[PDB]
């Protein structure tokens, strides 16, 4: 019932041989946290693109991929967005604060 603040940040990632180097959970019908439909980052691979860049963190909400908004979408819709990317990907995330 108290206010919850987030910091909104854009992160540009360049894929490596193993892709972006993180995992997502969440989505409408696939809640990562009860009552929350957000897409969440849940894993970051050591040595991967997200790791080396150093901005993305476990616990971050994934708000968008490129021009595709991921607020209140299904896990499948989030995956579809991430699948349809080139070697350069712009993520919009919300970090706890």
């Amino acid at each position: 019932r108290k206010p919850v603040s987030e910091k909104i940040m854009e992160i540009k990632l360049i894929k490596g041989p193993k892709g972006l180097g993180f995992s997502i959970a969440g989505g409408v019908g696939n809640q990562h946290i009860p009552g929350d439909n957000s897409i969440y980052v849940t894993k970051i691979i050591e040595g991967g693109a997200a790791h080396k860049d150093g901005k993305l963190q476990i616990g971050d909400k994934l708000l968008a991929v490129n021009n595709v908004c991921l607020e209140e979408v299904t896990h499948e819709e989030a995956v579809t967005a991430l699948k349809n990317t080139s070697d350069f990907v712009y993520l919009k995330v919300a970090k706890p604060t």
């Binding site: 892709g19 972006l20 993180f22 995992s23 997502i24 959970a25 989505g27 696939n30 849940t42 894993k43 691979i45 896990h75 499948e76 989030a78 995956v79 991430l82 699948k83």
Partner: peptide
């Protein structure tokens, strides 16, 4: 339930 690595 569903988790995806990318």
């Amino acid at each position: 339930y569903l988790v995806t690595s990318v």
